[PDB]
Design a protein around this ligand. Sequence first.
Ligand SMILES: Cc1cc([C@@H](C)Nc2ccc(Cl)nc2C(=O)O)c2nc(N3Cc4ccncc4C3)n(C)c(=O)c2c1
Lengths: 969, 276
Amino acid sequence: RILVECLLPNGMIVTLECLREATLITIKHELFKEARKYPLHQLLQDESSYIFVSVTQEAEREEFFDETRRLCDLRLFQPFLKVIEPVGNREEKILNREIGFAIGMPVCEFDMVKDPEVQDFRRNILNVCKEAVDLRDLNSPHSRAMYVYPPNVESSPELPKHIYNKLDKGQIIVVIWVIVSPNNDKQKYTLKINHDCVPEQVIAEAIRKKTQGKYILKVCGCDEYFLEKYPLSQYKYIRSCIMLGRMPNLMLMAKESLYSQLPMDCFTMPSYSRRITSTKSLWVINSALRIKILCATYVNVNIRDIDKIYVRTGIYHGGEPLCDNVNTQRVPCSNPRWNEWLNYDIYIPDLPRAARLCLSICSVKGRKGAKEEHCPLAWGNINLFDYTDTLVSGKMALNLWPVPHGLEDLLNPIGVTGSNPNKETPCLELEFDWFSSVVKFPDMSVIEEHANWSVLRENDKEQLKAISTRDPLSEITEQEKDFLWSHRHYCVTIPEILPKLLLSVKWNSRDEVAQMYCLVKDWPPIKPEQAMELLDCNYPDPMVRGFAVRCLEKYLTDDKLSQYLIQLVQVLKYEQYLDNLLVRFLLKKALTNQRIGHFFFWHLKSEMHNKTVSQRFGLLLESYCRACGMYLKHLNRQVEAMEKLINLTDILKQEKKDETQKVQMKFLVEQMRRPDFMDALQGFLSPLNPAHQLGNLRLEECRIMSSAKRPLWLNWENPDIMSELLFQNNEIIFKNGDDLRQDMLTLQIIRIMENIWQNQGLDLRMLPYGCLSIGDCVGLIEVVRNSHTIMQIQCKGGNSHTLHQWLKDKNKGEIYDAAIDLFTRSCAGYCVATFILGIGDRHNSNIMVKDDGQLFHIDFGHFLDHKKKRVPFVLTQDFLIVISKGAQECTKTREFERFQEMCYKAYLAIRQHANLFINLFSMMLGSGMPELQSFDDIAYIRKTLALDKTEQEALEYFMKQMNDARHGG
Amino acid sequence: NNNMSLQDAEWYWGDISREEVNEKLRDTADGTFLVRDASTKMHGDYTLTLRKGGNNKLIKIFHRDGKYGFSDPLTFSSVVELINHYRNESLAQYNPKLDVKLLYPVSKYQQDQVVKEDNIEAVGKKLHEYNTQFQEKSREYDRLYEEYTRTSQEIQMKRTAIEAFNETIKIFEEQCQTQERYSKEYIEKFKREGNEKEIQRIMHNYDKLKSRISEIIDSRRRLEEDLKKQAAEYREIDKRMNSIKPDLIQLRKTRDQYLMWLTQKGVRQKKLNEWL
Ligand SMILES: Cc1cc([C@@H](C)Nc2ccc(Cl)nc2C(=O)O)c2nc(N3Cc4ccncc4C3)n(C)c(=O)c2c1
């Protein structure tokens, strides 16, 4: 159904017509019969030995070695083909088109980059990729199954004694299914076993009751496996059936049926792998630092609104200046040329290894009195040493970046370094002083010589202890920096004081930095929760950041790495060179564990629209997708299904924007009925949980919601053979138009709060559902079954007693008391959690309640007070009537006094872990979220947790804020 | 007489937050200072904040038994005396690495007078003037920032399409250079012996190629003209945002200084959320 012009290899052109679902073999076969009716058809050869070549919509000249693709999958620019003979590696041209489809950009664009740091990274990162493929391939085929199906366990084998008491005498009852007959005879075997036996001792009893191992255990309904030896109660599945009163269902498979669905995969080195005097130390120069500003190419300023412009510079070591800033002279807006040496109060040998130049072009309006009005136009940052330890010399050109929305400072020391890859932007010319040689930064044997050149009981061990346990954003005076630095040899006794002793160093003094290096080299390791603080933007030094990465690689478990993977991907934007120890650590982990590799993929992929990071993250996606094995085909199917839904919902947003739910809901059933939409959106793994495999779509139930941005309710079958024990429908919201990064962070914090409360002796049950961000304001939301908003229950039930009558109607008699104690232990968690995070505008459209009484909050949006940078709670009298069991005096019962004791206990246990929550927000400052831009925006958490008060003055601050949110409306 | 009360000093600010002092020492000469209450909110602590070397230094004032000062030999009668001892002697007498004097005190009555007419009948109207003009600017700014990112994304689509034409045109022209030298001097001239092959097979073919080659060069040229026009409106929307951005910092400062000198100080008025 389209004319395709075909350029034969004898200078002749043809107009061939084909149907749009035709493979390349079909069109190629059809071409050399229509071509024998043309003049020089005896020069040609047989159809083989030829292939096609064309241009794609990403401006790529593409050779189609894969003859089974079809005419509509090609993404051509113009409808034409061309016959040539095949030059190139055939198995390698096929992998490059799969990799380029997953990450969203052609792999050929990386070859056309001339930066030698970029080309060093590409071939030097292939060394990590090879050492992992040898590691997940060592003891086979077991080691290959552990990679694909890794154990989802807890970090700790010991049960909280309040969880242990839900097991009678340390016994668990399990139901072990066995499919025996060829006609699916489902046998069940109920057992009772110690909570700490291993899965080879569980199987050993299921065989005696039915009358190396030959069998594995699987979770019925979701293809999770128990392969590695652990106590049974440490797997998160068995651990979550002990604290919910449910029964675990396990099915007894055979090893040969799992080992045989593992497709083998091999790693081969790419094409670019095969490809490819007198020096002065930094510490022998004797001169101040100076830089020359030549001119700016163009700036977009009006002549009748702005008087002058100038260039503002500064030297920085991670957010702090190393000297006072220096301006140029103010010139007229139409002649930006300065030709001016600027002089800095930094001496050349006193520059630290992570110094940067930060500059902006600024305008002066003034024009009214004396208080001049200054405003930045464009910013840019430069490293003063490059990735080979060389000080930068000679002329330089730099394209600048637009000011971030919501910023008014004059410099931007937290932005990225490098030129704007767009080139029709303001370009500023620079000039660095030349010292008749190549100048290198010293090496650490010369630095240890200098430390030993510039180089007893006490009773104030109690001042070092008080400083050690203080907030990561607490004030430090000048007297305490002098005190910390002079007692620096006894601080190795309080190993967790290292973050505070590093902010006492003078970094513009090479004598003090040399002594600090010798002191980090012998430092005792610290907990991975405390080493993650050393990886944000206040600690740029590379000797400090390698100490932090070494503490993670010894003490961070896969369980906690999954917990903290969002933050470990944002601090990649802070590293100053492409090749570094944090990127080698994270890539090693994602190539030995697909649960980690799955989410590592989607967190980098969702930020490829960002031009400040796209080349960094693109080179790293290229390296993962080249060694991930057979999992690149699963990812390719998830990218095709997501791109179908983005294209579909774009139609509903700007072509059906005004229509009604009848004409739109019929367009949707049209579009989804097409047989190509039906193959993309059916039979793929879920991105929210890659253990949940989606099946046949259920089109009758899919619908267009009436929420803000009109998301998609979608519904799949669970194709598992024992799906009936677990759920049977995967229901997912697709949303296109909302930023889902504040919700991922909110839902991650709540899952950390709950774990602190569970390990204290409290049972406040949270519901942190699934949420994933896949691109620029597009994402996926897990749906909870058997749940209603408070607003549905109030309308269906029609008053203030509606919710309590609904909740008794659903469960009668002996189980009315368990429905009341679960509504109460749930409402106390979301009451404390939403106060600490600053989450407001809670109403009956964004609070939901299950059938069994449990409660949860949804659709958070803005978390800190981003609006004001009181509205008493309106459902207060409705939840009081539930908490007091429908009594008459709600606020005076013994049941309401236990509601308050649980909130007080939960508030004071989060306040004991305030440093963990300060750091998780600090690691997100360059993320790009508008609520979280400076260290001034994290100050909200220090107010609600009352960190400057004492423990009794804080609790009275909580009681006084809750009383102000009482009955209200 | 230079030892007045600490509550009437110009450089004393009471209880203001740490992040509200960072908005007053931002890009000021080395030697600017003020004093406030310590963050603990226990009275008699008095942290001093000094600007020096591009940074904000933070120095504690101790209170042994009616004395004041920096170190343990507290030898001053009061804070106002201590501040005056160092407005004439450099701070190198305390720390040699801190060679600077207290030069430029951040006064409270220099900028608080930026507002005038402490009536409530006046400033309510002057607050109404600014709160209307301020938020009318933000309705004109954040509209432009919306048109700015949309014009940026359409510039980038066009530039990729121009690269798609350049690679497409590059293979036709190499396809007509094999039409002749590969075939049209050694098969056409050799066998020209009264054939009907010439005018149809070779000529008619090669003349529908050139009709197709130039039709591609006419769509590239039509797109290249909408990119020049599209890159000119993108610089006019970036000039206008550069002249609105300065006007809109001045309004917020002249507008917020009203809310915190008459409506919250001159009268405890819950009408401020009702004025607006
Ligand atoms: C039954 C009930 C009572 C209250 C408050 C009004 N009463 C107390 C709470 C704890 C204690 Cl220990 N005592 C009291 C007391 O009044 O004595 C609630 N408060 C919230 N809030 C409050 C708040 C403040 C600031 N930002 C966000 C938020 C969300 N929610 C989301 C609730 O479901 C809720 C439920």
